[PDB]
């Protein structure tokens, strides 16, 4: 199923609100075309590593431990969902 224009779903306040959690007061208007780029790099290195686990067990559902196993691979461990 194909639904495009959804890198533009990461809206303009929801990058500002993520900026405020990092402790950032004033931002530019050109981070919005940088953040959407660095985000899709990070999801093209997790979903590419997650699907090769789900294809390997011949599952059609990328389950909760799969993503945690992908994040185990990169060296960014996620607790709380298992694994």
């Amino acid at each position: 199923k194909v639904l495009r224009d959804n890198i533009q779903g990461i809206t303009k306040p929801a990058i500002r609100r993520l900026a405020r959690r990092g402790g950032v007061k004033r931002i530019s208007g050109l981070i919005y075309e940088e953040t959407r780029g660095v985000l899709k790099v990070f999801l093209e290195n997790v979903i590419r590593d997650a699907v090769t686990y789900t294809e390997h067990a011949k599952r059609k559902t990328v389950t909760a431990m799969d993503v945690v196993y992908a994040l185990k691979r990169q060296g960014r461990t996620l607790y709380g969902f298992g694994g």
Binding site: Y79, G80, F81, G83
Partner: protein
């Protein structure tokens, strides 16, 4: 079927230093998955300590070195001495 866990053994530690304290479901899974991760760091460094010294044997010496590597500074002083109590108490028994 059966999912093994460390959830029961948290209430036997939570009710040791904070006996009037509950703990939520979604916070159990963190202390559940804290254990399984900090398990296989210590095991998976004691494992690779077996190959580095050409032995097929995980002793209780090799778990001690694989805790002085993963834990930094002041945790590496306590969690060593909080294990050698539980071994010397164990071996004097049985």
């Amino acid at each position: 079927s059966r999912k093994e866990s460390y959830s029961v053994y948290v209430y036997k530690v939570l009710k040791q230093v904070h006996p009037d304290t509950g703990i939520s479901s979604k916070a159990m899974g963190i202390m559940n998955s804290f254990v399984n991760d900090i398990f296989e760091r210590i095991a998976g460094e004691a494992s690779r300590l077996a190959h580095y010294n050409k032995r097929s044997t995980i002793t209780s010496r090799e778990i001690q070195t694989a805790v002085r590597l993963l834990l930094p500074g002041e945790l590496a002083k306590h969690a060593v001495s909080e294990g050698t109590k539980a071994v010397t108490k164990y071996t004097s028994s049985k």
